[PDB]
A paper describes a structure:
The photosynthetic reaction center (RC) of the purple bacterium Cereibacter sphaeroides (recently renamed from Rhodobacter sphaeroides) is a photosensitive membrane pigment-protein complex that serves as a convenient and informative test model for studying the mechanisms of electron transfer, photosynthesis, and pigment-protein interactions. The RC from С. sphaeroides consists of three protein subunits and ten cofactors arranged in two membrane-spanning branches, A and B. The RC contains two bacteriochlorophylls (BChl), PA and PB, combined into a special pair P, two monomeric BChls, BA and BB, two bacteriopheophytins (BPhe), HA and HB, two quinones, a non-heme Fe atom, and a spheroidene molecule. Here we present an approach for stabilization of the photosynthetic reaction center of Cereibacter sphaeroides, which is the formation of disulfide bonds between its α-helices.
In three mutant forms V(M84)C+G(L278)C, A(L53)C+I(L64)C and G(M19)C+T(L214)C (pairs 1, 2, and 5, respectively), in which the introduced cysteines were close to the protein surface, disulfide bonds were formed regardless of whether these amino acid residues were on the cytoplasmic side or on the periplasmic surface. In the inter-subunit mutants V(M84)C+G(L278)C and G(M19)C+T(L214)C (pairs 1 and 5, respectively), the electron density for the S-S bonds was visible but of poor quality and detectable only with a low cutoff. The reasons for this could be increased mobility of the side groups of the amino acid residues at the interaction interface between the L and M subunits and/or radiation damage during the imaging process. In the G(М19)С+T(L214)C mutant RC, the formation of the LM complex is observed in the gel without beta-mercaptoethanol (line 3). Upon addition of beta-mercaptoethanol, this complex breaks down and three bands become visible, each corresponding to one of the RC subunits (line 4). However, it was observed that the mutations between the L and M subunits (G(М19)С+T(L214)C and V(M84)C+G(L278)C) significantly contributed to the stabilization of the RC. After 60 min of incubation, more than 50% of the native complexes remained in the sample in the case of G(М19)С+T(L214)C and more than 40% in the case of V(M84)C+G(L278)C, which was significantly more compared to about 20% of the undenatured wild-type RCs under the same conditions. In the case of mutant RCs with inter-subunit S-S bonds V(M84)C+G(L278)C and G(M19)C+T(L214)C (pairs 1 and 5, respectively), both complexes exhibited increased thermal stability compared with wild-type RCs. It is assumed that such strengthening of the RC structure occurs due to the strengthening of the complex at the level of the quaternary structure of the protein.
Residue numbers in the entry:
A (entry chain H): 9 to 250
B (entry chain M): 1 to 303
C (entry chain L): 1 to 281
The structure:
Amino acid sequence: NFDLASLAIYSFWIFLAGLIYYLQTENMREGYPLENEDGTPAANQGPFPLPKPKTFILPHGRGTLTVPGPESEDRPIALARTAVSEGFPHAPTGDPMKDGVGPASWVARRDLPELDGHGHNKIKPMKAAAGFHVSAGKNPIGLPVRGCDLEIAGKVVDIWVDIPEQMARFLEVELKDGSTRLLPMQMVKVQSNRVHVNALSSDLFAGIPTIKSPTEVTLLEEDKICGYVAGGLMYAAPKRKS
Amino acid sequence: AEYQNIFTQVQVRGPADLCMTEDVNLANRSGVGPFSTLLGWFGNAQLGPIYLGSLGVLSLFSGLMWFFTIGIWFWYQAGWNPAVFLRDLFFFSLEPPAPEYGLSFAAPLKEGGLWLIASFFMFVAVWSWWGRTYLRAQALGMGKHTAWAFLSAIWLWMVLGFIRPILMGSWSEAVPYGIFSHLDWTNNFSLVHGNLFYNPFHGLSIAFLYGSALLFAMHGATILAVSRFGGERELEQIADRGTAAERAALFWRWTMGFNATMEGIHRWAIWMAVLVTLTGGIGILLSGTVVDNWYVWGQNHGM
Amino acid sequence: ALLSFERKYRVPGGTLVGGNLFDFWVGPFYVGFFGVATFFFAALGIILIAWSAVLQGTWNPQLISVYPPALEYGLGGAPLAKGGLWQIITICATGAFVSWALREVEICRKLGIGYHIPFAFAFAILAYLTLVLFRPVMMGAWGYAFPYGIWTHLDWVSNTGYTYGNFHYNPAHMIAITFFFTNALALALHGALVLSAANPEKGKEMRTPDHEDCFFRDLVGYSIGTLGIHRLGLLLSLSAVFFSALCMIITGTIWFDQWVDWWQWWVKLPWWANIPGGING
Ligand code: BCL
Ligand code: BCL
Ligand code: BCL
Ligand SMILES: CC[C@H]1c2cc3[nH]c4c(c3C)C(=O)[C@H](C(=O)OC)c4c3nc(cc4[nH]c(cc(n2)[C@@H]1C)c(C(C)=O)c4C)[C@@H](C)[C@@H]3CCC(=O)OC/C=C(\C)CCC[C@H](C)CCC[C@H](C)CCCC(C)C
Ligand SMILES: CC[C@H]1c2cc3[nH]c4c(c3C)C(=O)[C@H](C(=O)OC)c4c3nc(cc4[nH]c(cc(n2)[C@@H]1C)c(C(C)=O)c4C)[C@@H](C)[C@@H]3CCC(=O)OC/C=C(\C)CCC[C@H](C)CCC[C@H](C)CCCC(C)C
Ligand SMILES: COC(C)(C)C(=O)C/C=C(\C)CC/C=C(\C)CC/C=C(\C)CCCC/C(C)=C/CC[C@H](C)CC/C=C(\C)CCC=C(C)C
Ligand SMILES: CCCCCCCC/C=C/CCCCCCCC(=O)OC[C@@H](O)COP(=O)(O)O
Ligand SMILES: CCCCCCCC/C=C/CCCCCCCC(=O)OC[C@@H](O)COP(=O)(O)O
Ligand SMILES: CCCCCCCC/C=C\CCCCCCCC(=O)OC[C@H](O)CO
Ligand SMILES: CCCCCCCCCCCC[N+](C)(C)[O-]
Ligand SMILES: CCCCCCCCCCCC[N+](C)(C)[O-]
Ligand SMILES: CCCCCCCCCCCC[N+](C)(C)[O-]
Ligand SMILES: CCCCCCCCCCCC[N+](C)(C)[O-]
Ligand SMILES: CCCCCCCCCCCC[N+](C)(C)[O-]
Ligand SMILES: CCCCCCCCCCCC[N+](C)(C)[O-]
Ligand SMILES: [Fe+3]
């Protein structure tokens, strides 16, 4: 009536309830405790406790991160509460593209470049990566870059490539006024004669944030560049036709 | 329409990573082979180098002896005829000794002795390979998760041909070496034991197998959708959370009320997959050892 | 309530229908127009199941079961108790499932991410529809669909499979199982690989993607890479469910014998089918 097989399956469901509870607390190491829409801690936090802290040791002497810890956005958030009660949207109080909110948001990451295994810059533009070149598909360097209004914004002058992983992560585009911005690889459609970008119209390339160096990008600069560009999908909608 | 990040658009080559530094004993490393344009359209294009230590030579040799032992036997059933060999490749079978032979090794070659010899070669190939997965990680300073996850598969395998047959009294309970016959063995095993759908550890095994497809479809789609924020560089997103990890988590929070962290999702993933063979091996091990009829056993205890 | 980093993301916009009338949250859940459709279909469809439970006469959850109309009913509609519940619930389920996918598309848009997730979910919806709508319609009866019960729906699988001998011999079923097992192999390695880099041997710094790629090249001579593994995982799971629908949709519509007879197209080929010996000689 109470088998060993019977004992095994009751045991397993008990292990399972403990495994799920363990797994859930492990995924509460970012973002928790939950907050009310005014930034103060919410009363009802769920029935799983916060996890005891753990520590990663960054290579090449870059410090130790410990999660969970005190969370700070570390930047001004340009949005207004619109509602007496909770649960409603929050209004951009500015240029949400320039202010970095909504689908245009970025994160206050360390203002350094990602570092590969031997400690070198992880992303370098081809002009400075000792050894690299193009090997298949249409080579975009030289090609004109075109936005969602169907006007041109400049030309590809380089490719920023992943040194250890050997892939292209950015196009470097030169603007009508002669400066340059980085285009994320994922956000472009390379073709036989051009390079097309639905994210932005020609006139919003000038607002892609700019780098403090011509052969290194930083993690904080990568977040600003990419958040801006994807935010164009919503915020550059008036330009977009067809 | 929009770029989908399913196939790489432009491919770039540099010097290949020889992977200096760390503790890998480069005496057992090969050179680096060709690169593949074909492979580069979907993933990396670097082929090799491979690490071939003493433990990997052992694995690879007894691995081939397993394959060749079944091959000879397959040719012998073809009467050494090349045309028959092809006509019946999926129908041949190398089989364990008859039930009368017990747990004995006296069985003559043509009546199961060969099956014991192949299974010894298999046994060595899989285990020395498991030592490889622990040592290659050890060399690079990594964690042992790959070895431990491998241990879940070896469990089910070990139960099928070795632990359950021993506890049963005869090698004839073990699995044959053939394409269609191992399928036939599987269908009969469920019949002999009164419908494996009613083995609750088989039902768990299926929930985790379906869930592994659910989980991997969510996680792949989710990382491809935040790749535009460099979301596939997950270790840095663990070191320094970016907008990629935050957009990903908020999609799931907004959709089903909870969500993961860039690290934590890989814990879910390793456990989902591992529990397929953990619960599977248990289900098989109790079949016929402790329960002969699962459907009947089901009625007496719950459903 | 909110994740600590969440607020800057809750901006207006992205809806496909309704404008800002459903553009708000309830707890963690985004609502949107299709989060209201999702609620109607799913609630009603639940009310039909509870009602089906008093008819059958039990509030035991394990035991409740809802069957399609009998084969004799064909494709026409059935009395509510003689099959119509299943028939409506099916509409309710299809409604909720598709509404959920379009809710995911709104969410992708307000967050400005790709539309990968609800696209992958649509394969799940189409395997479902293959079983309850496509295959039953192509054969002529709702009765070829499966019953909605924890334990009954398992017996339908067994009855259906054994109608064609050992269903293992369905070649599409072979390819799909091959994708299903390979998916779980890849899901296990990818979890163990990334967790071995972020959680390395004691007394060591965090590993880098350099080491992920070194580990697999040591191990098997090739590494698909951090973007390949995620592409690969999606492709594995989605092709497994594709050949699932493929293996079920040809069974009993264009193929009717024991599935093992399919393999004679190779064994009975005339220029080796008469040879002495082997298995088939
Ligand atoms: C795929 C081909 C077959 C099939 C073959 C099998 C086999 C074989 C088995 C199951 C088993 C299960 N199947 Mg079934 N099953 C199919 C169709 C379905 C559908 C559906 C709407 O199409 C659903 C919801 C289910 C659901 C389930 C669960 C009862 C159980 C665990 C699966 C799991 O973890 O999945 C992965 C999903 C997750 C991990 C996420 C959580 C899923 C939750 C648990 C599903 C909730 C079901 C709920 C009780 C029913 C809907 C109720 C409404 C809420 C009102 N099956 C079709 C008919 N299914 C197993 C079992 O133990 O059965 C008794 C089993 O052995
Ligand atoms: C008619 C047939 C019976 C049946 C009989 C069985 C039997 C018998 C078994 C299963 C088992 C399984 N069943 Mg059942 N099953 C049926 C119907 C189903 C249905 C369905 C929709 O109807 C489903 C979804 C399943 C699902 C499953 C899986 C969850 C499970 C196997 C997991 C796995 O990853 O194995 C694949 C993985 C392995 C075998 C491990 C491999 C590890 C080793 C080390 C690999 C070595 C490789 C070697 C070296 C090869 C060389 C390769 C080269 C070197 C490259 N069954 C019916 C009821 N089922 C298993 C189980 O555990 O049940 C409890 C099992 O043994
Ligand atoms: C004894 C029976 C026969 C046999 C007969 C059958 C039959 C008959 C069928 C299969 C099918 C399948 N079999 Mg077979 N099969 C056998 C042996 C096996 C073995 C084995 C090791 O022996 C394996 C691995 C498999 C494997 C499989 C897969 C290829 C496939 C099941 C997955 C699928 O289609 O998912 C598809 C996924 C879904 C349908 C999920 C849909 C989910 C939807 C969109 C949402 C639900 C959400 C839910 C309601 C939400 C609830 C609330 C939440 C909890 C909040 N079979 C034996 C020989 N097999 C099935 C198939 O191919 O179907 C197409 C099928 O019908
Ligand atoms: C957690 C459960 C899942 C799982 C996990 C898993 N498997 C694993 C691992 C993990 C975590 C490993 O670390 C390990 C590995 O190294 O993966 C890359 C492994 C592994 N899983 C394997 C297979 C496998 N896993 C399976 C299943 C599963 N693995 C589960 C779904 C299955 C099935 C039936 O579903 C199989 C077949 C291996 C690829 C590998 C272990 C390798 C090994 O032990 O090799 C020893 C044998 C040899 C080195 C060589 C033998 C000779 C060969 C027969 C080839 C001969 C070829 C001949 C010369 C030419 C012709 C061939 C023809 C086809 C043309
Ligand atoms: C295609 C690859 C895999 C996949 C993909 C996939 N599924 C997904 C997603 C993706 C990418 C989602 O985005 C979505 C999600 O939100 O996940 C958290 C979903 C999801 N996959 C789910 C389940 C599920 N997926 C499964 C399968 C898989 N889904 C595939 C293997 C299975 C099975 C049996 O293998 C199950 C059980 C949910 C967790 C979720 C879908 C949630 C949803 O659509 O919710 C809205 C609807 C409701 C809350 C209820 C509607 C209820 C009906 C009106 C009444 C009940 C009817 C039903 C027919 C009864 C079933 C009886 C059973 C006893 C058989
Ligand atoms: C060209 O032809 C030549 C001859 C060159 C070839 O090489 C052709 C080769 C082939 C045609 C190969 C064909 C191979 C197959 C069809 C193999 C298919 C295999 C399977 C379906 C495997 C199914 C599962 C088998 C299992 C579960 C085996 C279990 C192994 C045991 C756990 C090991 C136990 C050890 C024992 C009993 C020995 C005891 C000794 C100890 C030291 C413990
Ligand atoms: C409602 C809850 C009910 C609970 C009922 C009792 C449960 C009993 C326990 C179940 C076991 C669950 C935990 C299993 C996971 C163990 C975590 C683990 O593995 O810890 C060591 C880990 O660091 C090593 O890996 P890394 O962190 O990567 O080094
Ligand atoms: C009654 C029979 C039950 C089953 C018998 C045993 C079967 C084989 C067991 C396999 C378990 C799977 C591997 C463990 C889970 C995955 C590992 C994990 O999540 O963390 C591993 C962790 O520690 C890291 O170790 P270190 O690198 O040494 O710190
Ligand atoms: C000279 C050497 C000859 C080599 C011959 C080539 C063999 C191909 C085998 C497997 C490739 C598929 C690998 C898929 C499983 C990998 C799972 C994984 O962890 O991927 C992450 C990635 O490896 C890092 O980011
Ligand atoms: C069965 C697989 C899914 C298990 C669900 C685990 C619990 C999810 C709820 C966690 C709590 C969410 N919350 C409120 C803290 O945000
Ligand atoms: C699992 C291995 C799959 C590798 C096959 C890759 C197919 C080649 C795709 C070429 C892509 C061409 N294009 C225009 C998208 O760049
Ligand atoms: C030192 C090894 C030399 C590298 C050899 C390069 C191979 C040619 C690359 C083209 C790829 C061909 N293909 C179709 C397999 O992709
Ligand atoms: C080094 C090979 C390991 C041998 C393990 C398998 C034993 C095989 C038994 C075959 C029977 C031989 N004999 C003499 C009884 O006919
Ligand atoms: C790590 C993921 C945890 C998800 C939990 C999945 C629970 C599914 C239960 C299916 C029940 C099978 N059975 C035969 C015991 O009834
Ligand atoms: C075991 C299968 C059932 C899985 C149910 C999914 C868990 C419910 C998730 C909702 C959690 C959100 N909530 C209510 C905590 O805020
Ligand atoms: Fe990942």
